[PDB]
């Protein structure tokens, strides 16, 4: 009978940076998916009120408009390889929308960052918030910058649509040999 707290995730006032995405577990609630890119994989969204899952994971972050296509199975790029990677067998939906009004200040919102450098690609659903200085040459950096692995987006309202901030919520639908706790209102 409990409603799933979708608005608590979507309508969160502050979203995390893509390198520090926030994951929340949704369980033991009825999932009304009726409380911009809306891509679903391995599932029909016209049957989302028509399905049951053991758990639903809700990840949230912020990227540019041009990086939204990278949030998908099998993608490649600085966001997909180094900041947020989906599994090739991902089951769930990816939702993004324009956020220039909320996350772009006139001088620039430098609180949002993305990972540019890493020594290995991100394994599915991995997260990395380290500040270790990336060594690009043959000489060890000894902890002194040798590039900082993070770069600020600098969101201003004057940027183009391909550089404006977008708020992304990645719903992951998961099944295991366990009772289903998240169901649409039509199978409550």
């Amino acid at each position, epitope marked *: 009978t409990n409603l799933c707290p979708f608005d*608590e995730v979507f309508n969160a006032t502050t979203f995390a940076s893509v390198y*520090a*995405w*926030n*994951r*929340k577990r949704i369980s033991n609630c009825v999932a009304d998916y009726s409380v911009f890119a809306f891509k679903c994989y391995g599932v029909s969204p016209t049957k989302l009120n028509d399905l049951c899952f053991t758990n639903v994971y809700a990840d949230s972050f912020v990227i540019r408009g041009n990086e939204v296509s990278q949030i998908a199975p099998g993608q490649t790029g600085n966001i997909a390889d180094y900041n947020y990677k989906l599994p090739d067998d991902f089951t769930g939906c990816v939702i993004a929308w324009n956020s220039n009004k909320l996350d772009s200040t006139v001088g620039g919102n430098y609180n949002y960052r993305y990972r540019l450098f890493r020594k290995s690609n991100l394994k599915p659903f991995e997260r990395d918030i380290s500040t*270790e200085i990336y060594q690009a040459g043959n000489k060890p950096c000894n902890g002194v910058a040798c590039y900082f692995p993070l770069q600020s987006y600098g969101f201003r309202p004057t940027y183009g649509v391909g550089h404006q901030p977008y708020r992304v919520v990645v719903l992951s639908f998961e099944l295991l040999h366990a009772p289903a706790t998240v169901c649409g209102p039509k199978k409550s």
Partner: antibody
Amino acid sequence: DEVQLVESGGGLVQPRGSLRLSCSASGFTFSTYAMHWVRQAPGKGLEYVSGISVNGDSTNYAESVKGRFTISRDNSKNTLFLEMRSLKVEDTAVYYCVKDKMGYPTGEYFPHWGQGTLVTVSS
Amino acid sequence: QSVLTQPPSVSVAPGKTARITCGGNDIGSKSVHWYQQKPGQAPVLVIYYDTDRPSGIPDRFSGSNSGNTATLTISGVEAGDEADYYCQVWDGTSDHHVIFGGGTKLTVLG
């Protein structure tokens, strides 16, 4: 079996000194789990210290301990390490080695904790 | 920084139920985990993902999350439930990502 974390290497050290804590792990596949250290100053709450990836390729640190503490692991010998340098009087605490859940992302919650070793920094 | 606000101390009678709150900005947007630290003991996780108890934790321990307050409810309080209880969340905008609350000392009046 069952999970088991046994810390060692604590003691008393003067400020600006150095110390190395070791955590011996058993009851789980040490090579697959992310490891962390969480400390607790006496009569105070819990403060996250640092963490390490299953391979050691990724290390995270708290802002207070950045540039002074370095965390490493040896999956061959099933041991976690916390090398402490330039120790301050604020670093006095009981340091627990903790075990993450299986999978990613690492750092959500910590279901298994060690018994705890005490590090005291005093002039 | 994301700050989790916990009541410093809570006193309950044996057999009754105790409520320990955990406050934060949009705490419903984050998953809250609870830890129990008995005196002289290490922290032990009792609730994860705001509602679920790990194996071995009795059903008397319950979790909840709504709005800006997340509560941990212990029913039928026993003497062994006297401990320090900490709530924990994760934040990506804080530069300190692992957040532990101030903690609550649960005192049972046995």
